[PDB]
Amino acid sequence: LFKLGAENIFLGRKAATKEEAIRFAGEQLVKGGYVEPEYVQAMLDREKLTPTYLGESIAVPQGTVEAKDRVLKTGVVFCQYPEGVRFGEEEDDIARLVIGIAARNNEHIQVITSLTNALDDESVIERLAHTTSVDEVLELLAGR
Amino acid sequence: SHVRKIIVASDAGMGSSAMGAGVLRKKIQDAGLSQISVTNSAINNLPPDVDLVITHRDLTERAMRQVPQAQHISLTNFLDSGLYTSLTERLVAAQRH
Structure with a gap:
C-alpha cells in the first residue's frame, strides 16, 4: 500500500517537541506530493x-x-529521533520512531497495521531507532 | 446471540485504536478463535450489533452512550499490556463458558 525508499526515510533527527516532529513529517508529506498544505495543521x-x-x-x-x-496519495515518512521525542500521555511515553502518514479515504489504521505488523519484534524497533543505515531501514520494512 | 465481535474506538479512530486493534486481534487469532472478528473505527461510527466495545476510559462514557446495552471495556494506557493480557484471558474464558 505504500512506497518506501531513500526519499522518505529521515535519520538522526532532533526535536524538542512532538509538534515540531509532526510539522516536519507533515512538510515531507507535502513535499512528496502525498498531501496538500492543509494536511499539516490537520495532523496537529x-x-x-x-x-x-x-x-x-x-x-x-x-x-x-x-x-x-x-x-493526494497514500504515503508515509519515516522519521528517526534517536534521542527521543515525548509523544504519549506520560513523560515516559517517548518515541524514537515518528512515522508520519497520509492515507487515501481515511484508511490510516490500514497503514498503521502494516507498519506495526513489521514492528512486532522489540529488536526491530531498537535497530530502527538508532541505525545510521537507510538500506537497513528498507530491509527491515520491506516484508511489510 | 453469540459474542464474537470486538471493535476498538477512539476520538479519531486513526491512532491508538490502530494499536489496540492489532494486539487484541493477534491474541484472538493465536487462541484459534477464527470465529471472532476484529476491527476498529471512530466512536461516531459503532454498529448497534457490536457485542464488545473497547475504548480509552476517557471516551468509554461516549461509547456506552451510543450503546449502553453493549459491553464496554475501559483501558488506562495505550501499551497497558497487563490490562490487555487480563482482558484476553477473560474473553477466552467467556468463549468456552
Missing part, C-alpha cells in the same frame, strides 16, 4: 484529540477524518 489537530503515540517508542501522526480530501 489530530494530535490534540489524543496522542498518536502507540507504545514501544513509536508514534504515527496523521490527519483528521475531516482532511481526507486534502490527501
